[PDB]
Amino acid sequence: PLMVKVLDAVRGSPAINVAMHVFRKGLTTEEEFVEGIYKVEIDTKSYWKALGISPFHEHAEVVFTANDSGPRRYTIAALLSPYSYSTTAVVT
Amino acid sequence: PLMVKVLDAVRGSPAINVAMHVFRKGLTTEEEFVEGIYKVEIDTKSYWKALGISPFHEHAEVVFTANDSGPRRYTIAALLSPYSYSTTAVVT
Amino acid sequence: PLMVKVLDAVRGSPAINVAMHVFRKGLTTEEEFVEGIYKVEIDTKSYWKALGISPFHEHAEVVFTANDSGPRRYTIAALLSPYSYSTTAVVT
Amino acid sequence: PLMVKVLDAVRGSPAINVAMHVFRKGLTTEEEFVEGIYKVEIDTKSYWKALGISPFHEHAEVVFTANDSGPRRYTIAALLSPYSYSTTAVVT
Amino acid sequence: PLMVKVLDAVRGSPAINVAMHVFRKGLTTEEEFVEGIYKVEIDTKSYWKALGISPFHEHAEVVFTANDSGPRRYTIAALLSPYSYSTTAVVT
Amino acid sequence: PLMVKVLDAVRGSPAINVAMHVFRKGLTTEEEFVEGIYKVEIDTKSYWKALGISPFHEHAEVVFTANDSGPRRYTIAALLSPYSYSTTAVVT
Amino acid sequence: PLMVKVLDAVRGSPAINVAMHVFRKGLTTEEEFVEGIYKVEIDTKSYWKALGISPFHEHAEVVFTANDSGPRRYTIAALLSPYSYSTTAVVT
Amino acid sequence: PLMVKVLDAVRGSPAINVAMHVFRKGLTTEEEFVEGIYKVEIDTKSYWKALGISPFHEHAEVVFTANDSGPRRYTIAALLSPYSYSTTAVVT
Amino acid sequence: PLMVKVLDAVRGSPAINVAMHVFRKGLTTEEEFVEGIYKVEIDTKSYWKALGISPFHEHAEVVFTANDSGPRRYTIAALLSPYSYSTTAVVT
Amino acid sequence: PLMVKVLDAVRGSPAINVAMHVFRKGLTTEEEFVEGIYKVEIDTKSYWKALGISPFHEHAEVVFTANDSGPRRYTIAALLSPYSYSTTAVVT
Amino acid sequence: PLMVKVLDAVRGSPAINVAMHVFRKGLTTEEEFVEGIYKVEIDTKSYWKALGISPFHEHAEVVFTANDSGPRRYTIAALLSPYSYSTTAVVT
């Protein structure tokens, strides 16, 4: 007789992020899983992933170069941070 | 007799994000999963993924170059952050 | 006798995002899954994906170059962030 | 006797996004799935995907160049963020 | 005896987006699936997809160049964000 | 008779992030796992991952160079930090 | 008769991050695990991971160089630190 | 009859981080574990990890060089340190 | 009849980090553990880890050099140190 | 009838870090352990760890050099030291 | 009938670090242990650890040199030392 009670009585004006999971009971294999529920990804980089079976098997001559140079500005305010009765100013 | 009770009584004006999962019970394989419910992806990069079976198997001469240069500005305010009785100001 | 009760009584004017899953029970393989429920993708890049079976199998001479330069401005305010009794100003 | 009760009584003027899934029970394979319920895509790029079986199998000489330069401005306000009794102002 | 109850009593003037799923039970294959329910695509780009079986099989000499330059302005306000008793101004 | 009671009575306007998990009971294999519930990734880099079975098996001559140079500015304020009756100010 | 009681009565406006896990009971193998619930990653780098089975098996001549140079500024304030009745200023 | 009582009565406006785990009962193998719940990663580097089975097995001539030079500034204030009635000021 | 009572009555505005574990009862093997839940890692470096089984087994000629030079400044204030009624100033 | 009572009555505004573990009852093997509850890592270095089984087994000629030179400044104030009614000042 | 009572009544604003463990009852083997509860590691170095079984077994010619030179400044104040009604200045 499992019972879960969440934010039953809310009197007011909150700022809320609620993540709940209820569970009652082949290069890359993933099964029965929970991933990136509130995941935030900024300027992520993946070059070579899961190329495959027997790639470049014989007499491969590869030249791999990755140049991550760049003038980049992101400037996030209040990332994944709920706020209440509050002021968020991004001024440039 | 599983029972889940969430935000049953809300008196007021909140700012809410609610993610709830209730569960009662081949190069890339993924099964019976939940992913990227609130996934936020900004300027993500994937170059080579799952090319396949026996790619470049024999006598391959590849030249892989990735130039991630660039003048880029993102400037997000209140990302994935619910707010109440609040000010979100982006000024440039 | 599974029972789920969410936001049963709402008195007021909230700002709400509600994501709720109730579950009772070959280069890429994907089964019985839930993906990108509230997914946000901004300036995402995928160059080579799942090329296939035996691509460039013999005597391939490839020249792969990716130039991610560029003057780009995004400037999002209140991304995936419900707000109430609130002011969102984007001024340039 | 599964039972789901959502937003049963709403007294007021909320701003609501509701996604609910209730479930009772060959290069790319996807089965019995839910994708992009509230998915948001901005300036996404996919160059080469699922080219096929035995592409460029023998003596291929490819020149792949991708130039993602460009003067681009997006300027979204209140993306996927319901708001109530609120101001959303985009001024340029 | 599955039962789903949503927004049974609404007293007021809300702004609502309602997605509800009730489920009781070939290079690219998708089966019994749900996709792009509220998916939003802006300036998305797909160059080469599912070219086919044995394309460029022998002695192919391809020159692939993609120039994503361009003066482009999008300027969306209140994307996928229902609002109530609210003001949305896009001024240029 | 498991019972979980969280934030049952909330009188006021808090700023809350709630992650709650209730559980009652092949190069890379991941199963029965929960990951990235609130995980945030900024400027993460993965070059070569899960290349495959027997890659570069015989007489491979690879040149791997990764240049992570670049003028980059991130400038996040209030990352994953809910705030109440508060000011979040990013000035440049 | 396990019972868990968390933040039962909250009178006021706190800033809260709460993570709770309830549990009642082949190169890389991880199963039945809960990882990176509130994990934050900034400028992380992984070059070669899980290359595969018998890579560079015979007569490999690799040149691996990683240059992590770069003018980079991050400047985070209030990372994973909820604050209340407080002032967060990032000034440059 | 295990019972856990945490922060039952909170009168005021604290700044709180709460992690609670309640438990009642092959190169890399990890089982039934909880890892990096509130882990913070800044400028972490992993070069070669889990290359695989029999890599560089015979007559390998590798040149591994890692140059971690770089002008980098991080400048975090209030990392994983909730604060109340407080000032967090980053001035440059 | 195990019973745990923590911070039952909190009158005021403290700054709190709460980590509580309640427990009632193959190169690398890791079982039934909790590791680095609130561990924070800054500028950590791991070069070669778990290369694999029989790497460089015969007639290997490796040149391993690691140059950890670099102009780097971190400048953290109030790391993992909650503060109350307090002022945190980082001035450069 | 084990009973644990911690910080039952807190009247005031303290700064608190709380770690409590309550417990009632193959190169690297670790079982049923707790690690890095408040673990802090700064500029840690691990070069060669768990290379594997029979690495460099026969006729290996390795040249291992590690140069930990570098202009590096860390300058942490109030590390893992909660403070109340206090000033934390980093001036350069 | 074991009973533990800690900081039952706290009237004031102390600065507290609380670590309590309550316990009622193959190259490297580690069992049922507790490590690095408040561990702080600064500029720690581990070069060769657990290389493996029979490494450099026959006719190995290794050259191991470790140069720990470097201009490095750490300058921590109030490390793992909670303070109350106190002033912390780090001035350079």
Numbering used by the authors:
A (entry chain G), B (entry chain H), C (entry chain I), D (entry chain J), E (entry chain K), F (entry chain F), ...: 11 to 35, 57 to 123
What do the study's own words say?
Systemic amyloidosis of the ATTR (amyloid fibril protein derived from transthyretin) type is a potentially life-threatening disease that is caused by the misfolding of the circulating blood protein transthyretin (TTR). TTR is a naturally tetrameric protein with a very high β-sheet content. One TTR chain consists of 127 amino acids and the native tetramer acts as a transporter of thyroxin hormone or retinol-binding protein in the blood.
The larger density segment fits with residues Gly57-Thr123 of TTR, the smaller density with residues Pro11-Lys35. There is an internal cavity that is lined with polar and ionic residues and probably water-filled. Stacking up the fibril proteins along the fibril z-axis generates the cross-β-sheets. All cross-β-sheets have parallel strand–strand contacts. In the N-terminal arch, an extensive hydrophobic core is formed by two leucine, one proline, one isoleucine and five valine residues as well as the variant position 30. The fibril protein fold differs profoundly from the native conformation of TTR-Val30Met, which contains nine β-strands per protomer along with a single α-helix.
